[PDB]
Design a protein around this ligand. Sequence first.
Ligand SMILES: Nc1ncnc2c1ncn2[C@@H]1O[C@H](CSCC[C@H](N)C(=O)O)[C@@H](O)[C@H]1O
Ligand SMILES: [Zn+2]
Ligand SMILES: [Zn+2]
Ligand SMILES: [Zn+2]
Ligand SMILES: [Zn+2]
Length: 270
Amino acid sequence: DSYTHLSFYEKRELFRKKLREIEGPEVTLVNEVDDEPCPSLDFQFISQYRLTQGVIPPDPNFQSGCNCSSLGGCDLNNPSRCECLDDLDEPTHFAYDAQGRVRADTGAVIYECNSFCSCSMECPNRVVQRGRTLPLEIFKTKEKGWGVRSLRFAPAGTFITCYLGEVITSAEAAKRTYLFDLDMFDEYTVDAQNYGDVSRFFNHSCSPNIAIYSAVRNHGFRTIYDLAFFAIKDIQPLEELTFDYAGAKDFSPLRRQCKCGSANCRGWLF
Ligand SMILES: Nc1ncnc2c1ncn2[C@@H]1O[C@H](CSCC[C@H](N)C(=O)O)[C@@H](O)[C@H]1O
Ligand SMILES: [Zn+2]
Ligand SMILES: [Zn+2]
Ligand SMILES: [Zn+2]
Ligand SMILES: [Zn+2]
């Protein structure tokens, strides 16, 4: 295949070295199950979408901000008047509560503030934007390959990370698993095989503990938005992070049965 000249030790140290180059809280590597040293060594970690030819990026002439200024950004207690929330229904509220966690009544769409807005980067409505906050750990699972788990307790509503990768068209997808359509608002797709984030290793579960929230900050066509993972159950340290691929991430582009321990596992094929 490749990287045959590198020993088990050499491979593991180079991946751990790649992880330390990531910005933000630490990301660690662990394997107590078998002898695979690490995931692919040519994989590249990124912090924002990598666009490809064919992708029409957003037009900044459609961008709108909000007037709030104040002392420390927008005010959770005055959800009205903040223009970023106008798209919401009559009892308008920010997606986030006082603790910084997504609210229980929040829908599938989170409207955040932009660079056009007048609020600072400490605005309460820039949670997804400020990025990951939990230390994560890539580890080898028993029957699912690699997976991710948290080292700190993550109550429900805690932001975890975003799904990143190459943004590509249907055509580019045809020429070429890991495909994650941007189908919330109705042809761009996210391919995380060569470029992506830690979330590239999140495994599937039929009773998951994290879910996807479509975070929108652009006021143009909603062809590109953030795929934000939030906890929907409480997550104890070392608990594997899993979400429901169905409707979101593809199971395939002679299969393999699902191996989640849920008592209601429906039994998908990969
Ligand atoms: N509940 C699950 N049951 C069985 N296989 C799973 C699974 N969740 C993920 N997988 C496997 O991992 C793939 C999703 S991508 C991430 C898988 C893992 N992080 C790795 O790279 O080794 C699937 O195609 C499947 O082969
Ligand atoms: Zn505002
Ligand atoms: Zn705003
Ligand atoms: Zn704001
Ligand atoms: Zn299952």
